[PDB]
A paper describes a structure:
Here, we report that prokaryotic homo-tetrameric CDAs catalyze the nucleophilic substitution at the fourth position of N4-acyl-cytidines, N4-alkyl-cytidines, and N4-alkyloxycarbonyl-cytidines, and S4-alkylthio-uridines and O4-alkyl-uridines, converting them to uridine and corresponding amide, amine, carbamate, thiol, or alcohol as leaving groups. Both classes of CDAs contain one catalytic zinc ion per subunit.
CDA_F14 was chosen as the crystallization object because of its wide substrate specificity. Each subunit of the CDA_F14 tetramer consisted of a core of five β strands (β1 to β5) sandwiched by five α helices (α1 to α5) and exhibited a fold characteristic of the CDA family. The catalytic zinc ion in CDA_F14 was coordinated by three cysteine residues located in α helices α2 (Cys53) and α3 (Cys91 and Cys88). Three subunits were involved in the formation of the active center. In the crystal structure, the active site was occupied by two molecules of 2-methyl-2,4-pentanediol, which was used as a crystallization agent. N4-benzoyl-2′-deoxycytidine was docked into the determined structure of CDA_F14, and the following interacting residues of amino acids were found: Glu55, Asn42, Glu44, Gly54, Cys88, Tyr24, Ala46(D), and Tyr48(D). The hydrophobic substrate binding pocket area of CDA_F14 (distance to the docked substrate shorter than 3.9 Å) was formed by Val26, Ile77, Thr79, Gly85, Ala86, Pro87, Leu107, Phe126(B), and Leu131(B). The β3α3 loop (amino acids 79 to 88) of CDA_F14, connecting the third β strand to the fourth α helix, was identified as most likely to influence the space for binding of N4-substituted nucleosides.
Numbering used by the authors:
A (entry chain B), B (entry chain D), C (entry chain C), D (entry chain A): 1 to 134
Write the structure that this text describes.
Amino acid sequence: MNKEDLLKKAFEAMENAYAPYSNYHVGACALMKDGTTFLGANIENASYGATNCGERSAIFAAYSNGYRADDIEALAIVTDGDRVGAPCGICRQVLSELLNDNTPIYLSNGKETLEKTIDELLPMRFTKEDLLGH
Amino acid sequence: MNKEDLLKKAFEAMENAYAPYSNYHVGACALMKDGTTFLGANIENASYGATNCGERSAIFAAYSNGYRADDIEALAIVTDGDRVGAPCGICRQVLSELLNDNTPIYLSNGKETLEKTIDELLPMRFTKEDLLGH
Amino acid sequence: MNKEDLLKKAFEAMENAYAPYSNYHVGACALMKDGTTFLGANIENASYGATNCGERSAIFAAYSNGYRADDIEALAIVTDGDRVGAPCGICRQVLSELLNDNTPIYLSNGKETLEKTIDELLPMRFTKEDLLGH
Amino acid sequence: MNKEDLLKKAFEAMENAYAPYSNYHVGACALMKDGTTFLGANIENASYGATNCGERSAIFAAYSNGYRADDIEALAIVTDGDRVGAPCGICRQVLSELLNDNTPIYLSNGKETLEKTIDELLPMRFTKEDLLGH
Ligand SMILES: [Zn+2]
Ligand SMILES: [Zn+2]
Ligand SMILES: [Zn+2]
Ligand SMILES: [Zn+2]
């Protein structure tokens, strides 16, 4: 699957968002090396702190089906915002552990597209081995 | 799909848990009325507060693919613990919004099985309409 | 300090809430046996999942200053809602860990007042011992 | 208060951490322009996702007592780790909203000290304006 088709999957996921409170929709799609895709959308809650982000929905779905970082080809995350948005800090913390440093993260607001890797988005990362080796 | 087969799916999901820090594995499976299943497993992070529970993984996956409360037939959540466990308070807050009150939640530790609905697990719920009608 | 004066502290805390997105204000006050009080208010974030609840703000402040469950006398949580609200499921999971079973939790919307304990609000608790004994 | 004395307060807070699961202790101290300090420490939960970080404990306490970003002089965050640690991505998302761009964040492991600002720690921030303008 090419970048444009993966972004199309993420825009399809964006229509599945559950965002009664903000009305702000985020779509994501995690593409596995074997070609399997996992959609993700943001899912809000009346208790706002229980809200989940769309890119977390997608990666948690992939891991729950037995995929691991080494099995993931790419992640796309999209909005219809005025500028291209990046994953929030919570999602960066998750992706810092669950993605390898070469996995592209494609970001698009439907007008422009950017490509990042997780190390660019989160300096001075606190890692699994920082904790396990403590 | 019967209860025993749904529990078997959740036990499968339990083997996909990512829990390097606690070693405690939770599996879940959300069954849609159309027969589709969504696995969920707990996914930990070196920053413990970014951990996601397995039943959240499963329900977020279902919603991210366009299913809503009315489309969900049942949810199973399993462990290998010494007693049958219920969803934690975070997950109860999520399920209080994302499940209807008649949807069975099957709980099993592999030795005993219980059936609950969300209202039993969370008294005095704070709901979408409590917030939107404020 | 009596119940009415503790509720008054929680109403003071409610005026400190940071809720630019929902405009829904929650106040809390944790009272220590030595007479010390800790205010808490809800504090929202543009990434909704990073929002903190007021009763968590209060209890985390108490613990961060060295207090523990046996050092705490009571917790008050208040709103201006149409009915008396209880802590959300996230907060119940926290209070299940950080309060003793019978420590009073006073709830008020300014029109009615209720008294609860954590056991009444959270059946089938997942506890420290369930995890440590696994 | 000077930088060394603020770090000393954060090290005092670190001794108040509640980390029964990881045994990893973090302390923080938020210093207000009026001289008031707020300690924060990490506070774990048997449901790991309900864990709170120390720097969030501190900043939520400040806001719950009425302080806002313009009042915050500095934040210190400390550990005893092998290398100097930065706030995790969750905490960066919170600090992006609750601190001004140039408020100093002092980091120390007791052997080395660094000074950062939130802009250095979190590129491509998703802000209140991005949401409110949507
Ligand atoms: Zn996010
Ligand atoms: Zn849970
Ligand atoms: Zn809450
Ligand atoms: Zn943190």
